[PDB]
Amino acid sequence: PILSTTTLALMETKLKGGAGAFATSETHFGNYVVGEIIPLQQSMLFNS
Amino acid sequence: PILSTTTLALMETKLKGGAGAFATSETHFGNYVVGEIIPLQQSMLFNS
Amino acid sequence: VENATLARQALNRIQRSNILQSFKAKMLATLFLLNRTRDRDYVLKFLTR
Amino acid sequence: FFFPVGLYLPEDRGYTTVESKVKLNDTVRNALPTTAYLLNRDRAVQKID
Amino acid sequence: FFFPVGLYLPEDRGYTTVESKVKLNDTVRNALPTTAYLLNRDRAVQKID
Amino acid sequence: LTPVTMDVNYFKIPNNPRGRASCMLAVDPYDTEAATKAIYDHREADAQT
Numbered sequence A, B: 001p002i003l004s005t006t007t008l009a010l011m012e013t014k015l016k017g018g019a020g021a022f023a024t025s026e027t028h029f030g031n032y033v034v035g036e037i038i039p040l041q042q043s044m045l046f047n048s
Numbered sequence C: 001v002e003n004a005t006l007a008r009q010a011l012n013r014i015q016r017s018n019i020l021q022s023f024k025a026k027m028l029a030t031l032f033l034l035n036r037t038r039d040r041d042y043v044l045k046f047l048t049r
Numbered sequence D, E: 001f002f003f004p005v006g007l008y009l010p011e012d013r014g015y016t017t018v019e020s021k022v023k024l025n026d027t028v029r030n031a032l033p034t035t036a037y038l039l040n041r042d043r044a045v046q047k048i049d
Numbered sequence F: 001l002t003p004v005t006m007d008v009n010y011f012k013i014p015n016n017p018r019g020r021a022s023c024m025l026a027v028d029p030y031d032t033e034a035a036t037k038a039i040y041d042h043r044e045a046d047a048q049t
Helices: A008-015 A040-046 B008-016 B040-046 C013-030 C040-048 F008-012 F032-040
Strands: A032-034 D036-039 D045-048 E036-039 E045-048
Touching: A008 A032
Parallel strands: none
Antiparallel strands: D036 D045, E036 E045
């Protein structure tokens, strides 16, 4: 699974999170995010 | 992009926020901020 | 000392403005530093400079 | 990789776990999703419809 | 550098992410921002309209 | 000038203010027709957005 959301609001909530925030999944009344199991987005960009 | 805001409230929150807050890109109903991507405003100020 | 190397004629206006901006920043930074900050690196660097 | 779009969570079991963090205004476009957001090669947001 | 002024985000997909931190009183003058705020060379706020 | 309902997320990333990227390290070398198609042909998708 890859980080995806049904509404930009939770995406903006994810973008502000600290290190490793992408991994955790979150849901709302009718919206959700699924976290990527592999921390690919943090690891790949960390190389610069 | 440079740190910009469409209402004084978010600008005041940015000033009150600690180091590293300028990179954030928070939003609101019809108000928003765009955070600087290079931390220029913090790095430049330190050396006077 | 940090702007002595670029001025090579009479002070152009922009250089003087830079001098004033550095004046206001350094003046607000330097006031009562010994009472303000008490870590070794800052004090040693300040005295050396 | 696989990712879903256009899903409908049951209303008679609805719940929130982010109430203190995010708040969406009352409009059916938010209530019933029809869009998904994903990241590109560079860490930027992209939209699929 | 570039910066946007006078934009209008969609209302039907409106959303908030700072509700616990900041609050604005109900007035359309706030709802449709006609000005932008930017930072001077020194950390001071500038007001373009 | 720029329309009112511009997608603001375009401004949150390093981008070209023209609204359409034209970086010439992407196009094939000396293919003038391909380069002008990349810049001006709005019946073919832009890169990076």
